[PDB]
Design an enzyme around this catalytic site. Structure first.
Site, mmCIF file in Angstrom:
data_model
loop_
_atom_site.group_PDB
_atom_site.id
_atom_site.type_symbol
_atom_site.label_atom_id
_atom_site.label_comp_id
_atom_site.label_asym_id
_atom_site.label_seq_id
_atom_site.Cartn_x
_atom_site.Cartn_y
_atom_site.Cartn_z
ATOM 1 C CB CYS A 426 -0.938 0.016 1.204
ATOM 2 S SG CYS A 426 -0.150 -0.506 2.786
ATOM 3 C CB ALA A 428 3.402 2.708 5.538
ATOM 4 C CB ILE A 430 2.789 -1.858 8.206
ATOM 5 C CG1 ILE A 430 2.411 -0.403 8.440
ATOM 6 C CG2 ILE A 430 4.308 -1.909 7.874
ATOM 7 C CD1 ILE A 430 3.088 0.198 9.688
#
Ligand SMILES: CC1(N)CCN(c2cnc3c(Sc4ccccc4Cl)n[nH]c3n2)CC1
Length: 492
Positions: A426, A428, A430
């Site tokens: 995406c 970042a 996470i």
């Protein structure tokens, strides 16, 4: 230890705690999906807002972080200058609540606890509950053994006297956690020999898949979801693995968010790098393998697109899952690392052709051809699944489209012999990314074993979080993983 987090205090209770039991430098964190860092400085308490809509913890006047524990560790060891004057995090103000400890079950009879330990415990499984015979006290229930009589359940009274805890003799502890910790290191020995070893908390999160909806209703009363999630968050202090490679000067510019970094021990190492660059082995990405494997990575930056395609090539990955638009809320989340439809582009030593795009309701599919320049016969098709309708904040209200998505992606991967890890990213890498991967891992269990199988949502999340920091960001994603797995169970 993460004790600087108080799950259920108020702002005023936080100021009181810092002014009367802390000193300058004392700090704590607390929830309001928003959180606050409360810090005493010069005899006054400041409150610093933390926001997390699903991609990372955004600290006002600070940086962005993968977990609160990594946030605190950064500002306690690096200066990070949390300023406003400078704000220093010196002394954790510890919380005594047991409400997010794995072994604490609050309201629970002795017969219910003996049954739980009987059906799902092993030697050393234990828990702590509110005493019912003696209001105000607590009970430690332990299983020990090898219904053959070779095992047994033992109970131990925990007296609560003046907010301190003890087992009827010896030392008095400031918290149930201090007592459990102590008697974990120094087990209790009964008169006739049996040592009451507290090996692991009894597992209550594991359910049978068919009973998903029942558990989802249980977690939806007064909310149980928040308790279970925050008990997982409490386990993030065990996952502060080194991330030295991402902190190297030559690698600083390859991180979309400076402090959101891959663990050294699972990071993807890139070889066959041009010897001209000192450090050519680095990208912000981690191998995720359920213990189908995955690479979790950030959205490309302009200066890492070539490194991304070296990754894809080197790992033999054949499927890419993108869960962000290129730009959201006017801000860049991922540069366009693929060519326009029908076009051909070189990215360094790698060449990519966009063969064809296919548009569905929630996603676009791009059929890419990847090869190494100057080396015909290395070509392979990489299928880019670009989910486009994920909300800018929060999660979808319905999991249907996500599930139709993951199903297509799974079938593509399965159809390609000896395909490498599925790449998922995406912004970042996470939050949405861990949500999609965790959902996919759980559905995979069910796909292979049918509804007559055991699943453990927090256990799987913890396991993915040991391989990349903060995988799954918010309680909203947590609920959404449940709701997705529920909906998948009911489509079969
Ligand atoms: C009744 C409760 N107060 C205590 C027990 N329950 C738990 C239990 N375990 C966890 C975790 S972690 C985890 C889970 C499974 C395997 C391995 C890990 Cl590390 N997070 N939240 C949790 N809640 C629910 C709430």
């Amino acid at each position: 230890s993460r004790r600087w987090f108080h799950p259920n205090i108020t702002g005023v209770e936080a100021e009181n705690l810092l002014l009367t039991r802390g000193v300058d430098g004392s700090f704590l964190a607390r929830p309001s999906g928003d959180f606050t860092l409360s810090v005493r400085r010069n005899g006054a308490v400041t409150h610093i807002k933390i926001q997390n809509t699903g991609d990372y913890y955004d600290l006002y006047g600070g940086e962005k972080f993968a977990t609160l524990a990594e946030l605190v560790q950064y500002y306690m060891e690096h200066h990070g200058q949390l300023k406003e004057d400078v704000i220093e995090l010196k002394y954790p103000l510890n919380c005594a609540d047991p409400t997010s400890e794995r072994w604490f079950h609050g309201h629970l009879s002795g017969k219910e606890a003996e049954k739980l330990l009987t059906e799902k415990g092993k030697h050393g499984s234990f828990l702590v509950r509110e005493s019912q015979s003696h209001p105000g006290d607590f009970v430690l229930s332990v299983r020990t053994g090898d219904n053959d009589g070779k095992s047994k359940v033992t109970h131990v009274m925990i007296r609560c006297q003046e907010l301190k805890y003890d087992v009827g003799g010896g030392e008095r502890f400031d918290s149930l956690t201090d007592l459990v910790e102590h008697y974990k290191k120094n087990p209790m020995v009964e008169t006739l020999g049996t040592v009451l070893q507290l090996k692991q908390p009894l597992n209550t999160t594991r359910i049978n898949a068919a009973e998903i909806e029942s558990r989802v209703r249980e977690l939806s009363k007064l909310q149980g979801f928040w308790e279970e999630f925050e008990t997982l968050q409490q386990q993030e202090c065990k996952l502060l693995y080194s991330r030295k490679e991402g902190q190297r000067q030559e690698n600083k510019n390859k991180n979309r968010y400076k402090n959101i970094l891959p663990f050294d021990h699972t990071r993807v190492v890139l070889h066959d790098g041009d010897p001209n660059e000192p450090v050519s082995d680095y990208i912000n990405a981690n191998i995720i393998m359920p213990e189908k494997s995955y690479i979790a990575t950030q959205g490309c930056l302009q200066n890492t697109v070539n490194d991304f395609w070296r990754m894809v090539f080197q790992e033999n990955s054949r499927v890419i899952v993108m869960t962000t638009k290129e730009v959201e809320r006017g801000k860049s989340k991922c540069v366009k690392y693929w060519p326009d439809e029908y076009a051909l582009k070189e990215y360094g030593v790698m060449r990519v052709r966009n063969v064809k795009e296919s548009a569905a309701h929630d996603y676009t599919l791009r059929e890419l051809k990847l090869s190494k320049v100057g080396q015909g016969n290395t070509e392979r098709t990489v299928w880019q699944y670009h989910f486009r309708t994920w909300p800018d904040h929060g999660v979808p209200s319905d999991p249907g489209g996500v599930l139709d998505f993951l199903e297509e992606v799974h079938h593509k991967q399965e159809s390609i012999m000896d395909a490498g890890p599925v790449v998922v990213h995406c912004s970042a890498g996470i939050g949405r990314t861990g949500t999609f991967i965790v959902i996919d891992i759980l559905i995979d269990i069910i796909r292979e074993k049918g509804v007559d199988c055991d699943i453990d949502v927090p256990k799987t999340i913890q396991m993915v979080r040991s391989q990349r920091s903060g995988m799954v960001q918010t309680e909203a994603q947590y609920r959404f993983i449940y709701m997705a797995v529920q909906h998948y169970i009911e489509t079969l």
